[PDB]
CSV table of C-alpha atoms in Angstrom, one decimal:
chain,number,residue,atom,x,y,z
R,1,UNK,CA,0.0,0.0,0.0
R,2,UNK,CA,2.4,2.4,0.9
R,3,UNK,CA,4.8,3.6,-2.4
R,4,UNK,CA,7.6,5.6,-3.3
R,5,UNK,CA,7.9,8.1,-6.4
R,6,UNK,CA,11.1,7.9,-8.6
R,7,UNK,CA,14.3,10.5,-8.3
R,8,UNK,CA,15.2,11.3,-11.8
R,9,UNK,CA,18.7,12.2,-12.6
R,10,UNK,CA,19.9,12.4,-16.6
R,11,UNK,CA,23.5,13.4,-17.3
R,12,UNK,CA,26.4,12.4,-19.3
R,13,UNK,CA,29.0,9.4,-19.1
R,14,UNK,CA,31.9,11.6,-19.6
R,15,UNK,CA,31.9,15.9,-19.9
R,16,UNK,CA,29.8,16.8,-23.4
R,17,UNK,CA,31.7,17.9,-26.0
R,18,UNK,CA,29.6,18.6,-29.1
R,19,UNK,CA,30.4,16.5,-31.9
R,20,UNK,CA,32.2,14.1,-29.5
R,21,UNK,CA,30.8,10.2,-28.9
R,22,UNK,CA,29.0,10.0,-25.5
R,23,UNK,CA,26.6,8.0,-23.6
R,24,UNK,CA,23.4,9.8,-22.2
R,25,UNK,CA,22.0,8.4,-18.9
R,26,UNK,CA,18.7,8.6,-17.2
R,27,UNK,CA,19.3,6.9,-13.3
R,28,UNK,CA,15.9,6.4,-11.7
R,29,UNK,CA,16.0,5.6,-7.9
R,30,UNK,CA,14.0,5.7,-4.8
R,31,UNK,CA,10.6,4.2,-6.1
R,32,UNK,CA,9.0,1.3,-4.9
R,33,UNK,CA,7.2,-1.1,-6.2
R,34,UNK,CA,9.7,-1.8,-8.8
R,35,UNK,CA,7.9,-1.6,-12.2
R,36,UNK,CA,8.7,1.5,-14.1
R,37,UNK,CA,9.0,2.9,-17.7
R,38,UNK,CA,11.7,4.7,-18.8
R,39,UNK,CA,12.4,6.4,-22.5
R,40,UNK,CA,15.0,8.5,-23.5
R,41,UNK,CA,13.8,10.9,-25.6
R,42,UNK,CA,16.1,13.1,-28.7
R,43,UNK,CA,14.4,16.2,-29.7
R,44,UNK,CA,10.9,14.9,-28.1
R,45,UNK,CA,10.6,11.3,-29.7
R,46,UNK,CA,12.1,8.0,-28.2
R,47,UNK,CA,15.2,6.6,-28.7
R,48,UNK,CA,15.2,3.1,-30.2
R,49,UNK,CA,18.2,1.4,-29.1
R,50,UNK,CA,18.1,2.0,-24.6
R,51,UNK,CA,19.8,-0.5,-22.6
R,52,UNK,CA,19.1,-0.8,-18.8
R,53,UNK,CA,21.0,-1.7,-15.7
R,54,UNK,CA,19.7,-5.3,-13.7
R,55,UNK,CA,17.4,-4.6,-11.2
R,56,UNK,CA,18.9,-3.8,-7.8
R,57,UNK,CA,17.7,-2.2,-4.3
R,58,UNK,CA,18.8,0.4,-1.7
R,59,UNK,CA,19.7,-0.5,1.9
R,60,UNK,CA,16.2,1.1,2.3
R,61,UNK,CA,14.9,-1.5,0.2
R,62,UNK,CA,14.0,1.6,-2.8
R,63,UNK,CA,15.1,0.0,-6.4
R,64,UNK,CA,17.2,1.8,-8.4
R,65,UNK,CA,18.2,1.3,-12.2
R,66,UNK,CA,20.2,2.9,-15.2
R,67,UNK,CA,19.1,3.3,-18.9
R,68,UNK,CA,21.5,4.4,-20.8
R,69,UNK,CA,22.4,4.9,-24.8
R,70,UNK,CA,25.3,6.0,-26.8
R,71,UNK,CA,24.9,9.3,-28.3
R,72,UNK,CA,27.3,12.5,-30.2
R,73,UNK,CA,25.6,15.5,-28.4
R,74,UNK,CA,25.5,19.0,-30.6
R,75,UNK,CA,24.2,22.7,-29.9
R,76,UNK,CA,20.5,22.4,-31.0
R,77,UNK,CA,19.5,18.4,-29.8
R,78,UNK,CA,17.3,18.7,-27.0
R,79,UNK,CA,17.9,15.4,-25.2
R,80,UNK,CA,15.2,14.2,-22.0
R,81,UNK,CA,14.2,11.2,-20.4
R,82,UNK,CA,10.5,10.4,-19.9
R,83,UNK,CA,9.6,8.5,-17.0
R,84,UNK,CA,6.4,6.7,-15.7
R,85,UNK,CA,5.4,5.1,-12.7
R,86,UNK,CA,2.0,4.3,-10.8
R,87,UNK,CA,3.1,6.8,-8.1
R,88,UNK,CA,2.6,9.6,-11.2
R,89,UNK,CA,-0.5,10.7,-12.3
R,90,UNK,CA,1.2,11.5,-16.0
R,91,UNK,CA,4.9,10.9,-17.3
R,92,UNK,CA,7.1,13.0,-15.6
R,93,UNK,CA,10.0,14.3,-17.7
R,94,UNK,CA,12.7,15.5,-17.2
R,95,UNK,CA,15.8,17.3,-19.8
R,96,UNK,CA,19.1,17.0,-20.2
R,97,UNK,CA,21.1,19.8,-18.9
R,98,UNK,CA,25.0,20.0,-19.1
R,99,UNK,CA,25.5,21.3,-16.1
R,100,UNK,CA,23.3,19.4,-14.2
I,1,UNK,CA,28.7,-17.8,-4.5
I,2,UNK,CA,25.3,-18.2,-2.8
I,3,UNK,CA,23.7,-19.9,0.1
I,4,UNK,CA,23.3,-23.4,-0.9
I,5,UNK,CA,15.7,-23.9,2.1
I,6,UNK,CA,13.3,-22.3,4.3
I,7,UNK,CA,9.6,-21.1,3.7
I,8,UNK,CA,8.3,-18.3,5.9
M,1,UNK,CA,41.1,-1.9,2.3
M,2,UNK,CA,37.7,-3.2,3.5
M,3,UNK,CA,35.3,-5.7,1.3
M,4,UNK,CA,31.3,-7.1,0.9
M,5,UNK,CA,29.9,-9.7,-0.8
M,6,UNK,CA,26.1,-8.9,-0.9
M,7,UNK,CA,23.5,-10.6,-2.8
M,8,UNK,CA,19.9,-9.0,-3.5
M,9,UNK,CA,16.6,-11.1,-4.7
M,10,UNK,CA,13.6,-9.6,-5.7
M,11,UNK,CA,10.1,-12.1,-6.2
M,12,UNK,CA,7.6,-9.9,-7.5
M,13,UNK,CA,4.1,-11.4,-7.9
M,14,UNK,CA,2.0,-10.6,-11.3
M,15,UNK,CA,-1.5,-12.2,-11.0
M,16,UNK,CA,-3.2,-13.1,-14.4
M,17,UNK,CA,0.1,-12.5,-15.9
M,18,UNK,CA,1.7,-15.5,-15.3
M,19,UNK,CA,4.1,-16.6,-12.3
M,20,UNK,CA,6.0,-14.4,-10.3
M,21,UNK,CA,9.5,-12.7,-11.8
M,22,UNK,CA,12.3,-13.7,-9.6
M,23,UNK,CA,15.4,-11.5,-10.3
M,24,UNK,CA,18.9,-11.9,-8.2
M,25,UNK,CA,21.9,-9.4,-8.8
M,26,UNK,CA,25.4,-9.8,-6.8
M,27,UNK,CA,28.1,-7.7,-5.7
M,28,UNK,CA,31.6,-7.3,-4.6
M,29,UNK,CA,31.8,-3.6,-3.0
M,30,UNK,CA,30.0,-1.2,-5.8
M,31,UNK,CA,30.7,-3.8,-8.5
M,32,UNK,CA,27.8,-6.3,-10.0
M,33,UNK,CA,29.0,-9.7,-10.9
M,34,UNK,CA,26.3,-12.0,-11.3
M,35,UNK,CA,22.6,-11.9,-12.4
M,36,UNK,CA,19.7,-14.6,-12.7
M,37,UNK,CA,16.6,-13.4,-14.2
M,38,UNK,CA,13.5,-16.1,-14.5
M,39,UNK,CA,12.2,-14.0,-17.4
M,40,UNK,CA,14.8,-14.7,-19.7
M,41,UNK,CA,14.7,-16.6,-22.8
M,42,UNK,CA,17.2,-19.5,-21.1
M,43,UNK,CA,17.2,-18.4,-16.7
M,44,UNK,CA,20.6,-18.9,-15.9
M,45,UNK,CA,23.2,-17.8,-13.8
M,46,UNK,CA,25.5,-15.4,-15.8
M,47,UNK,CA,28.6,-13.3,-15.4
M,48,UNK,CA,28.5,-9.3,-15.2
M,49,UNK,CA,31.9,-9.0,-14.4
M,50,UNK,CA,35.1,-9.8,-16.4
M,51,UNK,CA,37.1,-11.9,-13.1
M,52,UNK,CA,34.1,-14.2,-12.6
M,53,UNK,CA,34.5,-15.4,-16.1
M,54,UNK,CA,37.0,-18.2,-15.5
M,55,UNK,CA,34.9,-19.6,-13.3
M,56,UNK,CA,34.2,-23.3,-14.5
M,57,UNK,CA,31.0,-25.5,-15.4
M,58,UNK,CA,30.5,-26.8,-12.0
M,59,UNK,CA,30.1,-23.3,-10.6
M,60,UNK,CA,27.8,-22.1,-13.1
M,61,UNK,CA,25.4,-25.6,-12.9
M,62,UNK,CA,25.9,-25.3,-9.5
M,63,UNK,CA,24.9,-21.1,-9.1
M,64,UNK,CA,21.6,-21.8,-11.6
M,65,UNK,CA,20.5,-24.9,-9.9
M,66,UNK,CA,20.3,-23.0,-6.8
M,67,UNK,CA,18.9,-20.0,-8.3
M,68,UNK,CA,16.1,-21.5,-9.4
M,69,UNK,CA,15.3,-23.6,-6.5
M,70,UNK,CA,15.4,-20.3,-4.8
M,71,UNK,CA,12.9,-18.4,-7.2
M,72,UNK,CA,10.3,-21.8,-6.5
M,73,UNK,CA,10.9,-20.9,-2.3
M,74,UNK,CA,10.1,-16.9,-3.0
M,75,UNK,CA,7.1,-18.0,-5.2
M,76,UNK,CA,5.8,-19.7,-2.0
M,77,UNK,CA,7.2,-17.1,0.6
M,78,UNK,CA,4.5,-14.4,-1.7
M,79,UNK,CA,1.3,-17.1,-1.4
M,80,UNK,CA,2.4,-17.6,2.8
M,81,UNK,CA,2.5,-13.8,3.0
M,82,UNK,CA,-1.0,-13.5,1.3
M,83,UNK,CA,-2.2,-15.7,4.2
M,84,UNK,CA,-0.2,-14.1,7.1
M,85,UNK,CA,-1.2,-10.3,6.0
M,86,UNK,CA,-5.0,-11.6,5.1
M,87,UNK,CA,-4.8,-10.0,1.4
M,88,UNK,CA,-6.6,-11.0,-1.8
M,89,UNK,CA,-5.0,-13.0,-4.5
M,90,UNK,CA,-5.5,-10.2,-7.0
M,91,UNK,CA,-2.4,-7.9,-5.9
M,92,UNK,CA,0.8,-7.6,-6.9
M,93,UNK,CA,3.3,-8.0,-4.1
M,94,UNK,CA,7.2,-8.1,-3.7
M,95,UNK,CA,9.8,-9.9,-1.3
M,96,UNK,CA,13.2,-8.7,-1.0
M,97,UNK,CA,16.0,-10.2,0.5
M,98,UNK,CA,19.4,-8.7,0.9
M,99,UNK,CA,22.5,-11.1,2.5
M,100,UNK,CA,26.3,-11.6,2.3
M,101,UNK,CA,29.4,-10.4,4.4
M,102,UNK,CA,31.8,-7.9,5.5
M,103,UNK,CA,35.5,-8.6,5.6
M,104,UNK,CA,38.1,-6.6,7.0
M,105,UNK,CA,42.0,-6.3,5.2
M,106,UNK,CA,43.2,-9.2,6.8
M,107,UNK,CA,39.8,-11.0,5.2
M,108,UNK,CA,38.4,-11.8,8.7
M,109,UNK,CA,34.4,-11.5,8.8
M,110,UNK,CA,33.6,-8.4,10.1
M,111,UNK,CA,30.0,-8.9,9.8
M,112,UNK,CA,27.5,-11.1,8.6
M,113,UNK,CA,23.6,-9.8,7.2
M,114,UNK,CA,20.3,-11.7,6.3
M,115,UNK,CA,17.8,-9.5,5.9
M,116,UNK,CA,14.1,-9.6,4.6
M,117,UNK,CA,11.2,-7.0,3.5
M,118,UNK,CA,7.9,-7.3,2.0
M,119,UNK,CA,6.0,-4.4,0.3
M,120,UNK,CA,8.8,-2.6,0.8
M,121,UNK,CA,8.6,-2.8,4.7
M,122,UNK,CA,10.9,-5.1,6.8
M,123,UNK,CA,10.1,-8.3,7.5
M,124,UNK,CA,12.8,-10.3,9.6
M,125,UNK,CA,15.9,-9.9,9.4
M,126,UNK,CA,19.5,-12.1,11.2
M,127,UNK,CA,20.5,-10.1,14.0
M,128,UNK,CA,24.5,-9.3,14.1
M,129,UNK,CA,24.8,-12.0,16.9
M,130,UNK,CA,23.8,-14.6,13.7
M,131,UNK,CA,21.7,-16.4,16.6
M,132,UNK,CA,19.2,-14.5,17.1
M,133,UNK,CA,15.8,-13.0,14.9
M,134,UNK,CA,14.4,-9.5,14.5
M,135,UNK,CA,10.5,-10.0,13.3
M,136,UNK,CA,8.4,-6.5,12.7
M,137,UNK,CA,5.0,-7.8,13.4
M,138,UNK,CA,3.1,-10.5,14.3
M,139,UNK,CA,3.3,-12.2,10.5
M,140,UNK,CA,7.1,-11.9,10.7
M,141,UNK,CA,7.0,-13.5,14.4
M,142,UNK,CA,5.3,-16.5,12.7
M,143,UNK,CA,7.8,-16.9,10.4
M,144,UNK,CA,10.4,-16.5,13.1
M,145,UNK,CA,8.6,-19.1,15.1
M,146,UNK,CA,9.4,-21.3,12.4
M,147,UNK,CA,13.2,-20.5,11.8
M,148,UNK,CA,14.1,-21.0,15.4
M,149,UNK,CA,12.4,-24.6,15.0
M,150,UNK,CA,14.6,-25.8,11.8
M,151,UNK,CA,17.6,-23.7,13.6
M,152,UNK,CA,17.6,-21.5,10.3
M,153,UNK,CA,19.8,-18.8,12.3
M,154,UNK,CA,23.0,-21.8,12.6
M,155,UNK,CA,22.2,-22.6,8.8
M,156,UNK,CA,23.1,-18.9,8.2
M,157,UNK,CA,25.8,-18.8,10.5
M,158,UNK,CA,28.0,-21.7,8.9
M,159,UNK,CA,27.3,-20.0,5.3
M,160,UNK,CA,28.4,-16.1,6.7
M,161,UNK,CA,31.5,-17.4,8.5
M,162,UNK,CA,32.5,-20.3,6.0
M,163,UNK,CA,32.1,-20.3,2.0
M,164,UNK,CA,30.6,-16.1,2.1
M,165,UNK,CA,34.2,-15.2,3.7
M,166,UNK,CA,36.2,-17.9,1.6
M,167,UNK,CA,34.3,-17.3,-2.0
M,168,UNK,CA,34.9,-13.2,-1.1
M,169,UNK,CA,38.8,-13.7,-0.3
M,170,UNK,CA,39.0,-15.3,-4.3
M,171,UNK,CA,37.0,-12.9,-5.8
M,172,UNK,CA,39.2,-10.3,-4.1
M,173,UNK,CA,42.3,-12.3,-5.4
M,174,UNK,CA,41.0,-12.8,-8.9
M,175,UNK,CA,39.7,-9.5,-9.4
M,176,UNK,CA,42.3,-7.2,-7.9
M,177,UNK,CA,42.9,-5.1,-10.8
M,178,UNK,CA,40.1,-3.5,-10.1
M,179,UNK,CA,38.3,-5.0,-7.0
M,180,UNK,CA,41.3,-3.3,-4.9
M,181,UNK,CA,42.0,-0.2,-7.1
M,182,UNK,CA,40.6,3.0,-5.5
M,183,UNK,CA,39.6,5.9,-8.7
M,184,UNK,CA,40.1,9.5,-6.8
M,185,UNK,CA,37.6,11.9,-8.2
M,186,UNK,CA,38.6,14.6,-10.7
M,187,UNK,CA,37.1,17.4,-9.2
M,188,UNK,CA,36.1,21.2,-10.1
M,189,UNK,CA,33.7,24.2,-8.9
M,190,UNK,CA,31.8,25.3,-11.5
M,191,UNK,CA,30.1,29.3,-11.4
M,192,UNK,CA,26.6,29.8,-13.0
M,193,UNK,CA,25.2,33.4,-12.2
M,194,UNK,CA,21.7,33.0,-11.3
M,195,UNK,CA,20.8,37.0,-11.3
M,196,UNK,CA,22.7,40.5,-10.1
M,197,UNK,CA,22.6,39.7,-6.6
M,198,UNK,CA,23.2,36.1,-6.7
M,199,UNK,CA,25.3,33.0,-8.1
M,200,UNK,CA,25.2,28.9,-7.7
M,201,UNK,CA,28.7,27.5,-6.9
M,202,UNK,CA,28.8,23.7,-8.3
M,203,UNK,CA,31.5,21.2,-6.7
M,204,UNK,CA,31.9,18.3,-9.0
M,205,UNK,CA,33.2,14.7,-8.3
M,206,UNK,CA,33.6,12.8,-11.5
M,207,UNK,CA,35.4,9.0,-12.5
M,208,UNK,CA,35.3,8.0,-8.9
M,209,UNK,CA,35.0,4.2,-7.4
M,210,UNK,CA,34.2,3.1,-4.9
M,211,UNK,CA,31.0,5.2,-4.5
M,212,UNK,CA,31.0,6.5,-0.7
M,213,UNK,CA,32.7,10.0,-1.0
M,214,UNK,CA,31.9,13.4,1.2
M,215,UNK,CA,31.7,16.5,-0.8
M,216,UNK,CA,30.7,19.4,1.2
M,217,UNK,CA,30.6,23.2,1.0
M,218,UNK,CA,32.0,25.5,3.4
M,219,UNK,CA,31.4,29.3,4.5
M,220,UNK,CA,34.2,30.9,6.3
M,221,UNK,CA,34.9,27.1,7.6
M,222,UNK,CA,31.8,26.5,8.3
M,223,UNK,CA,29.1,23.9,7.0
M,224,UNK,CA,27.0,24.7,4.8
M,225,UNK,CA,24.6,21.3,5.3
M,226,UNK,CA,21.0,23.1,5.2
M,227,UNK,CA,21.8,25.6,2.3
M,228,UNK,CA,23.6,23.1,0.3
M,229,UNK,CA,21.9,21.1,-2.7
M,230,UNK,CA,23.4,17.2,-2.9
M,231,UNK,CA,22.3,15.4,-5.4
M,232,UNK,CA,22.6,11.2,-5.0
M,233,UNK,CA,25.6,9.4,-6.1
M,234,UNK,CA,25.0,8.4,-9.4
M,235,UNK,CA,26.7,5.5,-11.7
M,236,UNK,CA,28.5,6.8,-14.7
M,237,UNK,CA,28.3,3.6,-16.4
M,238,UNK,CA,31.6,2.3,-17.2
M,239,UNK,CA,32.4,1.3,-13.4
M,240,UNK,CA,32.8,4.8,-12.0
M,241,UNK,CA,30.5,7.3,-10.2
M,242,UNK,CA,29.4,10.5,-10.3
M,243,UNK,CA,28.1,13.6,-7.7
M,244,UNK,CA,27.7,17.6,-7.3
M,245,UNK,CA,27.3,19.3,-4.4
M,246,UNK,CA,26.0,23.1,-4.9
M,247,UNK,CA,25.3,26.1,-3.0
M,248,UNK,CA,23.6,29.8,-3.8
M,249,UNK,CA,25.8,32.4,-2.7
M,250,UNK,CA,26.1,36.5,-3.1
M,251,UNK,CA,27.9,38.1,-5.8
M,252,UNK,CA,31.4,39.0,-5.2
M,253,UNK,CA,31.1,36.4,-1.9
M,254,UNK,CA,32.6,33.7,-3.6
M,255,UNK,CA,35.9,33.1,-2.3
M,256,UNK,CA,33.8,32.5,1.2
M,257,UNK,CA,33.4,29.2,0.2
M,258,UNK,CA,35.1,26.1,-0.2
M,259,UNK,CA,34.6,22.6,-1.4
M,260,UNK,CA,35.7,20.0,0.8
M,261,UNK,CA,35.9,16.3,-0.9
M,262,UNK,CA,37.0,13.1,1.0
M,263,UNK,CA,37.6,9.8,-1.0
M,264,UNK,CA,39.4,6.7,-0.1
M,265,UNK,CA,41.2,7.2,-3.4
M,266,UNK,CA,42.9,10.3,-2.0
M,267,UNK,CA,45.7,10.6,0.4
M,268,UNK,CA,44.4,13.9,2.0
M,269,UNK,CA,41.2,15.4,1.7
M,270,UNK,CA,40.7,18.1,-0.8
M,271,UNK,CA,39.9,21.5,-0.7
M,272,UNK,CA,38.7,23.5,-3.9
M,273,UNK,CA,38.1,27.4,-4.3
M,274,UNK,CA,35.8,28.9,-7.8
M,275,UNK,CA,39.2,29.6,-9.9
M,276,UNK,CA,37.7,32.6,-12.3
């Protein structure tokens, strides 16, 4: 009965340097029950090829997972990950910002 | 490795 | 210098959609090793990490045999916690279980855990003595009934002290290269000027492992613990971590602050000033 809504977090593997070979990461943690749907999203539509992180739990028993994809950022793609979860009453999303 | 059972 | 072996199972029931998903992850320290999933194609137990590789058949047979005589026991631990909690077969519910050991650098146990949770919630769990049980309510005490009368807590106790310590020493030995290397963070302050009269201050940890690192700001040496934002530790996804620590502070103020950053990876903790 009781539940707990996802942190988001989206960021970079290594520092963005446009034109430069990354991976882009959205880390969801903190929510319970455990299923969740994640997208990452490149100028608003999803990104086919998202690979995720094994399920795992917090000493707090909250699971936690990382979806992540390869991507070369520029200066005008918007990037954003899209999350839903039964603690949201509509996906909650949330864009990717350089500087966190 | 893991524990190599006991039902609640 | 200090080690764990922990592994984590997760049973979570589905009704009308089948039986119930039973998913177990393990780790050395911050690194996964092994998974089993009973959703995939062929359930298995398989290696995450590049020093469990070598292990042989035997261990692998003998990992997924037990694997999935553990994901039949948690489908039956979610059907006797229907009955003990008096809820309807149409829910979905989870059991967790988290155990394993702590070793210190000499590989001695430090301390053994065996601990339990449904919904979310704790359920029992091994107390540090390895004896003894901690129940939460009155289904748990049940349960706990029934451990001390099949001497469960000795079961555990021979597993925590014997092959938990002994398979963590070799996977220690076979994965030093990384299992024992310590990754200092590469660290900055980063400036961002919200309006006239004020400016966010960012401290950045980046490449680090293990995870567990303090980064804190600092006014005129002194913590800055309510005013500063912390965000969680974050994997980077190729082994390392990641984590910012920020605080709002008045224009021309800035060299009141410093970032403080403690890491096992570094000799001496670090102070950092904005460099404009």
């Amino acid at each position: 009965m009781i539940q707990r809504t996802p942190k988001i977090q989206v960021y970079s593997r290594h520092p963005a340097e446009n034109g430069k070979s990354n991976f882009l990461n959205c880390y969801v943690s903190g929510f319970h029950p455990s299923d969740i749907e994640v997208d990452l999203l490149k100028n608003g539509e999803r990104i086919e090829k998202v690979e995720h992180s094994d399920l795992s739990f917090s000493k707090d028993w909250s699971f936690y997972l990382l979806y992540y994809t390869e991507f070369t950022p520029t200066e005008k793609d918007e990037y954003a990950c899209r999350v839903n979860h039964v603690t949201l009453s509509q996906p909650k999303i949330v864009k990717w910002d350089r500087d966190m | 490795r893991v524990k190599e059972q006991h039902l609640w | 210098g200090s080690h764990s072996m922990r592994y984590f199972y997760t049973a979570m029931s589905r009704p009308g959609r089948g039986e119930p998903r039973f998913i177990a992850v393990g780790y050395v320290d911050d690194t996964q090793f092994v998974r089993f999933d009973s959703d995939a194609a062929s359930p298995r137990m398989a290696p995450r990490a590049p020093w469990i590789e070598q292990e042989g058949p035997e261990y692998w047979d003998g990992e997924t045999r037990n694997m999935k005589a553990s994901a039949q026991t948690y489908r039956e631990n979610l059907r006797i916690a229907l009955r003990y909690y008096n809820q309807s077969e149409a829910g979905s519910h989870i059991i967790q279980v988290m155990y394993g050991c702590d070793v210190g650098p000499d590989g001695r146990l430090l301390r053994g855990h065996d601990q339990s949770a449904y919904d979310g919630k704790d359920y029992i769990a091994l107390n540090e003595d390895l004896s003894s049980w901690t129940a939460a309510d009155t289904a748990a005490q049940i349960t706990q009934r029934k451990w001390e009368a099949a001497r469960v807590a000795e079961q555990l106790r021979a597993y925590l002290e014997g092959l938990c310590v002994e398979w963590l020493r070799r996977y220690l030995e076979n994965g030093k290269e990384t299992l024992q290397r310590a990754d200092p963070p590469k660290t900055h302050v980063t400036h961002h000027p919200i309006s006239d009269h004020e400016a966010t201050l960012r401290c950045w940890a980046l490449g680090f492992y293990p995870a567990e690192i303090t980064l804190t700001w600092q006014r005129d040496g002194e913590d800055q613990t309510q005013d500063t934002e912390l965000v969680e530790t974050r994997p980077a996804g190729d082994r390392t971590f990641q984590k910012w620590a920020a605080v709002v502070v008045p224009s021309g103020e800035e060299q009141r602050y410093t970032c403080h950053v403690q890491h096992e990876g570094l000799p001496k903790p670090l102070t950092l000033r904005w460099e404009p």
